[PDB]
Design a protein around this ligand. Structure first.
Ligand code: CL
Ligand code: CL
Ligand code: NA
Ligand code: NA
Lengths: 191, 191
């Protein structure tokens, strides 16, 4: 029951990465889009990655066109869009992006089947179905672009955030969890 | 937090019934349709009503056109359809039917807002959205025609069944619950 059963192809199509490569690391899975209202979170995700990389955080981005069709581009067009359009201004992610694919429905990526079903969903509301480009609909489906899952260094899911939760709050929660683990380790030895 | 905050108009349009009239009774809420694959459950519901009426069971039926559009008729056409078409054969329900209305979405009947949110939903699967004629979609939505809720004699919800659970199994569960309550009453007095 770990993420190490799975892997994904990098966005340039050149390398399949088994998630076992992230053994010993905290992994933050984020489904992404280039034309979302939350696409500015890319800037904050870069900052989070740079700040917490020393403590074992790895961010992985999964482009998905299932939420308002907000990732229309081919895989080769995604990095250019981020750099020159939105966020634009020369932006380049400092974390790994993978090929575009489904996160919900019959053709969803299997590691997302695992992740989605490991934690309760992020809201009671699925939303209006016209905006949700998949079938069938299920209680634990990802609700929108930029939903987030934290997986621990043992490959086991820890927690899941609503897409609109700020990246600062996500950071604060990761740090708190890492501190609790450190403290709980020290305390177990004294005991 | 009881069903006694609500009521509904009978299918003939002649009487509004406050659910407080069912104080002291077990109430089984069933959303119904005339052209459903489960419409034959009407025959079993009649039998359940006749068998458990002496022990305080009341069945209430709420026609709804939101599931495959399987209740197209006007209110005055529903009883004739049941009697002459499906189930047909002269069938007449022996329990009260109310006016057609919504059970999910923005215009859902308020007592169903209460009921749906009182118990977990009946399956992980909502289904394919083309068959579900409401918006927005929510985790606790009724899944199909013939979902069922039991409310106790104090007006508080007890349990909820999947639509495909057989009426014999529903009966067995009601009876078991009523027996447990009787036994738990006797046992509390001895104690
Ligand atoms: Cl977005
Ligand atoms: Cl049905
Ligand atoms: Na849809
Ligand atoms: Na629909």
């Amino acid at each position: 029951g770990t993420i190490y059963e799975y892997g994904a192809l990098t966005i340039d199509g050149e390398e399949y990465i088994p998630f076992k490569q992230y053994a010993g690391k905290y992994v933050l899975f984020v489904n992404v889009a280039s034309y979302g209202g939350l696409t500015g979170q890319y800037i904050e995700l870069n900052a989070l990655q740079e700040e917490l990389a020393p403590f074992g955080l790895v961010i992985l981005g999964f482009p998905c066109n299932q939420f308002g069709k907000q990732e229309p581009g081919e895989n080769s067009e995604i990095l250019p869009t981020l750099k020159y359009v939105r966020p634009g201004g020369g932006f380049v992610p400092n974390f790994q992006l993978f090929e575009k694919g489904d996160v919900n429905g019959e053709k969803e990526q299997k590691f997302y089947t695992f992740l989605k079903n490991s934690c309760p969903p992020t809201s009671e509301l699925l939303g209006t179905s016209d905006r949700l480009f998949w079938e069938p609909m299920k209680v634990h489906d990802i609700r929108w672009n930029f939903e987030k899952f934290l997986v621990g260094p043992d490959g086991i899911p820890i927690m899941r955030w609503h897409h609109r939760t700020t990246v600062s709050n996500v950071k604060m929660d990761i740090l708190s969890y890492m501190r609790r683990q450190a403290a709980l380790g020290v305390a177990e030895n004294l005991y």
